[PDB]
Design a protein around this ligand. Structure first.
Ligand code: 247
Ligand code: 247
Ligand code: 247
Lengths: 525, 525, 525
């Protein structure tokens, strides 16, 4: 079970609830802290004193004072008038992550909402009731969260087999009686960063697994091309350049290639090269390369930088997940806090940074593909990995194009966290556009799986063409088998699309990270 | 019927074939010119002389000389090895536009393909056989066109109710015997810009209708707010600043508001303002604005600039549609032309420019929405168009957000025509990424319909709140009725998403352009 | 004196050396380490053992084996052939930061450089010999570092009065004998990230001061328009949403407005509303805003997010400064390390994020300017801060434009860390472009000072027009006076460009941060 206590929720926890339908539980302590903050708050709203969104209009219309006698209407009109989302609907897991983020937020106890709201949200998650949430509308997350809030009151739509269905129907067929929003409840359900933070959580968690799966195929490729292990030696990172991510990537690369009979040690390389040099020449040519190209050597530095960005994003997301990103807020013994914790700037930036970092991860993976397919660049491998008569067959020549194209495409994706546009009578004069940033990172993550899919297939192909299977390390063999289990060796030319999408789906499921765990002792950071 | 003669095909013609399933016909003359270019070419290939893609390997593997005895295999291996597309599938109309563009290209007669290829392509279009074409893979359009070529040989997949189905099955169930590719036919079917040019055609055609529909709601809005007609007077454009698009937009605005009883003439404005000024004051305040804000005045200049960009794009597309964008090429009495007419740079640029122009069209539409919803900015209209008790009801306050958000999103879309990345052993060292550019423009076009949807609804709402219906011009009344036919006046607050998507779908169908044509004499440029 | 030991250098220290010309000293322990490593390495090189860039060609030409008899020539040809920088030259302070970063890198003792090289770079810094370094060339920093390396051997140019002067002459004048590059010294000098790390250090250090100065004006503005203090209450951050930067910004704002007679507490706002309301009916309008717009309420969340980004960048830069970003590397008792520690991905990413963060800092400042100039949003202040008769005078109307334009300009600056382009026979197939990333950030930083300059002038003007000087807090009176000491109150309209440039310059040297330190007891985070 996952404890949604507004204090200890983690990015991985969110993914379990969202992706693996893990049961959720709001601890008694959170319910208690919620019921008590609600109790006090109600006594305040009963005196009809000015409170944003409770006894006043919303946004710019805050100058409008509303009498407590309207309590339920004010909250309902809000949820309805703001359910203005457009575009595609979020997938089931994305919608669950968002709902989980809003629940954790309210579970912190400063939102002044009745316990049944938390209970009803936890119920929807546990009973598989997923709101239909359109992706566009959030300025950074009113619209998206309004569609969620709608379902709690028997309105809006819920997801069922990919399509939206009236909430009223699904609820009636559940024996669940919709709720009636009271003081501040409508506002609290929609005034937060749960959309960008929920989706961001999924993206960053998966981004880290992608970094791992990139290291996994990179290792296999390095073995298949008989690269040097020098670039990954601990001294060059742990000692000479202590960036956390760099140290982690190098450690993972050393572990992945451990036991390989194909990789080369620097000592052997220079000795081999030394034997190759004559004594009378001041300058002489050699076919031996003491060092390989950047794409097969600067891995610790590049993927490591990506990891650093991802670590920073996860840290921000963890703080956010367990924060009262709502307004106004309640603190026992104090005036009602009127601030802007609903402003997603910290997540907007974090996700924009993830978009950039993942784009470079893809750039690296595509150049490695180029490396293995180019005869002048690959170590003893036929052009474009053609196993038969080249020219007559193109081998992987056509498969490189989608990878190359996705790099160009990811590069057309610009930062959204800096594109605020003033709205609502200039009341919202500076916003974060955070959910766009999150959707941007998701897109790159998705495109990267396709790029990586081509690389995984190319690597497995490089293995059988060279006849180097037996030399592969235990991990490389596991990776190879995982690919071959999905797609066979490329003999004559054939329709490629199905094979690529098959491997890319596997990557999106973390299937290669699983193969390593299930087939080796290796523990990847 | 649409004549696909490789000489006179127009962007509108492509849309008819693609969107309205208009019958296609390859004229006897084109078939003749095709059979004759094929005849001669065959005599050339029979001498086993070096010809790219016919008797040699493809791309970098052109150094590989292939014997004519392989004819069919070479062409088939090519189509299969290059069907490496990934991502979503193009919709039925998009796939039809692409196929139509490839047919027109071959119909020009310099591709040296057998007539049955043209006949079979025309057959697929006329019989409703739509290839399943994944959107990603083209470097600017091998992969996408390879998926098309696959279906001609009974391979790959075809679209059926949104899903891909094996071509072999569908063909067998059609009594159609797949084709067998011969000398150069596989290469000719995939070596062109038909993907970006086919999709570009649809986008630009629809872009022009969007410009018209933006002018339509802008006119209604100007009437509803009682704006001045001064900005649209012919002298200010036809004489003072002769940009084609500017002249066209102003002419359309004058025609649309013709007969309005709400608009104001400059003469009346200054007279009204003159009566309002005292004689003893050197400087005095007034609530009268002789001029309105840019969003309700710089329409000719802004939408006109958009039109200019769109006119330029359509011109490029028309030239491209009727060009031999293929390689190598055949010209009677000459050596086989080995060039690069498959390079989509002219379309890549054109579509990137359309992406930019349409983004600004959206920027303008969103500020007009802001204009009508802001009490301090709208002419005698309640805040956020709330017809009842503001504050208690938010009216259109929540509806502005998706429009504002889409502007920010369109701004994160960067040019693709400059992002070439070298591939295929540096053989393709400079590409255009044109299909990405085309998909970029499509996205903005799609987002703009949502922005416009909010504006159309806001305008109709501004009409009933002000009680100005009776004053609307014949065209404004037609536009108003068209909206009300889909969505009712906004009384109390209510779920907005459905209403917005309903109007946006209508816009994507050109429903408002239709209302004007069907309800008025007005002829819009 | 700043200790350059390759272990403890800080960004702050880098600035002292670069901006304040603090003296540099390589500690004896570092000299001893470098000496020992040099002697051991020399013994290895003397045996003609294959070592990258010592006994082999460079980059792709690593396959060329060069005899040790060409020691000096090899290192020298490298520096010359790579001194291909173009574009403007870095300023004195920027060039010193680059030299400083390189010196610290070599001082770590893993570069196998003779101690004299450390001594000479130190001497250039301590004696004011500044390399003329072209800003463009680095793929991320060979070209720019090669121009620096050139000056050590008496070649290239030295900067003087913004003009380049042949090094040989300068050294001849100062009485210094150029050095002769020995094994690996040419490569060690140019094979690192000192260009982006040096420049990045200055930028990040100043960016933090810019965040402080943004908080300083914002505090003054808030007092000038009597905004609420509820948004900065500790429990809303320290407790509710503990993002480090957010907590710091709130804490700073709290300290800045302490002792103000103009700011209002939420308790007051609600009491004023409670009284303004006369419970006769349910819904009523009020002129009182219980909460202010985002630009005056979301300060901790937005500037806090910027701080978070800057803290991460500073942390990455601190690690990088004290790293052996060079290749190959010497580790006693171990094989020579052949990796890629010269790859700037970690800093390239870091600076791209700083570019993004600062852009948003400017977006916020520009909207705050819009706030006080717009009569509908200023809260009683005259339109455009005109003190005389509006219309006849425009006041600050024209001054807003450069600020607005700069926001647009900063948004046209895209990430560079993702724009790698393969070069050098594909040996450098994945680079970082980090120096471009650092210059992008410097540009936004510079542009922001202009935006803030207009805001500082507008704030002070608002103080004057409202006659609220006496009600200002101590910090606010100090900020106000600092401005007034440079620019007079705006009476009649007048040329504004000199006034803005004067305050923009004051901001670039941190004069406002200094006024606070000198006039108050406030210590800002
Ligand atoms: N997030 C609130 C809000 C603003 C505007 C509309 O239409 C709905 C909700 C808020 F106002 F911004 C706030 O909580 O301060
Ligand atoms: N468009 C051709 C091509 C190149 C590469 C691959 O793999 C398939 C097809 C061409 F080579 F570029 C050409 O026609 O010149
Ligand atoms: N930075 C080195 C380099 C590369 C290319 C050229 O032309 C000069 C120097 C290196 F190669 F990258 C290296 O491995 O250090």
């Amino acid at each position: 079970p996952v404890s949604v206590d507004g204090e200890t929720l983690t990015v991985e926890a969110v993914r379990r609830v969202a992706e693996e339908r893990a049961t959720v539980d709001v601890p008694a302590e959170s319910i208690a802290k919620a019921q008590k903050s609600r109790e006090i708050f109600e006594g305040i709203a009963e005196q009809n004193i000015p409170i944003y969104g409770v006894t006043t209009g919303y946004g710019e219309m805050i100058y409008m004072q509303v009498d407590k006698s309207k309590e339920v209407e004010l909250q309902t009109n809000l949820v309805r008038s703001h359910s203005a989302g457009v575009g595609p609907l979020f997938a089931e897991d994305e919608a669950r992550a968002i709902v989980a983020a809003r629940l954790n937020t309210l579970a912190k106890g400063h939102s002044a909402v009745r316990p049944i709201i938390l209970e009803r949200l936890a119920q929807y998650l546990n009973e598989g009731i997923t709101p239909a949430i359109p992706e566009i509308g959030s300025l950074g997350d009113l619209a998206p969260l309004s569609h969620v809030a709608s379902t709690l009151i028997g309105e809006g739509y819920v997801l069922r087999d990919g399509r939206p269905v009236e909430t009223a129907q699904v609820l009636a067929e559940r024996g669940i009686e919709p709720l009636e929003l009271r003081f501040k409840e409508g506002l609290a359900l929609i005034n937060g960063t749960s959309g960008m933070t929920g989706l961001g959580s999924l993206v960053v968690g998966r981004a880290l697994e992608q970094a791992q799966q990139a290291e996994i195929v990179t290792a296999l490729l390095i073995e298949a091309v008989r690269g040097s292990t020098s670039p990954f030696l601990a001294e060059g990172h742990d000692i000479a350049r202590p960036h956390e991510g760099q140290i982690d990537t190098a450690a993972n690369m050393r572990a992945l290639m451990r036991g390989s009979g194909l990789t080369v040690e620097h000592a052997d390389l220079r000795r081999e090269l030394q034997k190759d040099k004559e004594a009378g020449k001041d300058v002489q040519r050699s076919e031996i390369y003491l060092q390989k190209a950047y794409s097969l050597r600067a891995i610790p530095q590049v993927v490591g930088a990506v990891r650093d960005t991802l670590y920073h994003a996860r840290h921000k997301l963890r703080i956010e997940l367990n924060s009262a990103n709502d307004n106004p807020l309640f603190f026992e013994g104090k005036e009602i806090f009127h601030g802007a914790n609903f402003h997603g700037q910290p997540i907007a930036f974090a996700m924009d940074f993830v978009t950039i970092a993942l784009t470079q991860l893809g750039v690296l993976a595509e150049r490695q593909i180029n490396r293995v397919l180019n005869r002048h660049l690959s170590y003893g491998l036929p052009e474009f990995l053609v196993s038969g008569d080249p020219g007559l067959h193109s081998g992987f020549a056509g498969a490189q194009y989608p990878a190359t194209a996705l790099v160009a495409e990811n590069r057309t994706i610009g930062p959204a966290s800096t594109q605020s546009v003033p709205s609502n009578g200039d009341n919202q004069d500076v916003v974060s556009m955070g959910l766009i940033s999150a959707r941007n990172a998701r897109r790159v993550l998705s495109n990267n799986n396709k790029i990586l899919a081509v690389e995984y297939l190319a690597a497995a192909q490089a293995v059988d063409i060279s006849g180097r299977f037996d030399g592969l390390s235990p991990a490389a063999k596991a990776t190879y088998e995982a690919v071959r289990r999905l797609v066979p060796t490329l003999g004559v030319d054939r329709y490629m699309a199905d094979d690529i999408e098959l491997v890319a789906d596997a990557l999106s499921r973390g299937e290669f990270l699983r193969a390593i765990a299930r087939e080796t002792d290796i523990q990847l950071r």
